[PDB]
Write a protein that binds this ligand. Sequence first.
Ligand SMILES: [Cl-]
Ligand SMILES: [Cl-]
Length: 164
Amino acid sequence: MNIFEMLRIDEGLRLKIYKSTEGYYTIGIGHLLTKSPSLNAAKSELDKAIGRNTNGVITKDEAEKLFNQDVDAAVRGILRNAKLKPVYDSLDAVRRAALINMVFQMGETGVAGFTNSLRMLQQKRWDEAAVNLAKSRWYNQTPNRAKRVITTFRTGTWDAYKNL
Ligand SMILES: [Cl-]
Ligand SMILES: [Cl-]
């Protein structure tokens, strides 16, 4: 298992614009287009991202290209973040994949706000961190996905994703 397969399981794959769990226009493998309520605004963002007149439909290769760019940006956002970087550098490979997932879902800024959980992760207090992470809107809004990521941080294995 790897970050790619992991997030592809968490986000799924859709070739037409759709509304995410937060009601924002998205496409492909969780690629957010815009927070605006306007479909046109989303189709515009989409064409600009793809470099062609899409008409709200992309191919599989194009989704995958957006995905590669997004994973990359997530890693780089972590590395450039003074609050995230140290955490990331202290973890093992599996847990690093769990931090990337959160950053991809919620943005570098949202993740840097889990101050207490970040400290526990850094301290390698797995069970405590797992409990702290669960006390969040994140966990209450998307509990199944949050559980998979939390389990990952807790056990350092891919068990929550084996089966999927
Ligand atoms: Cl883009
Ligand atoms: Cl969920």
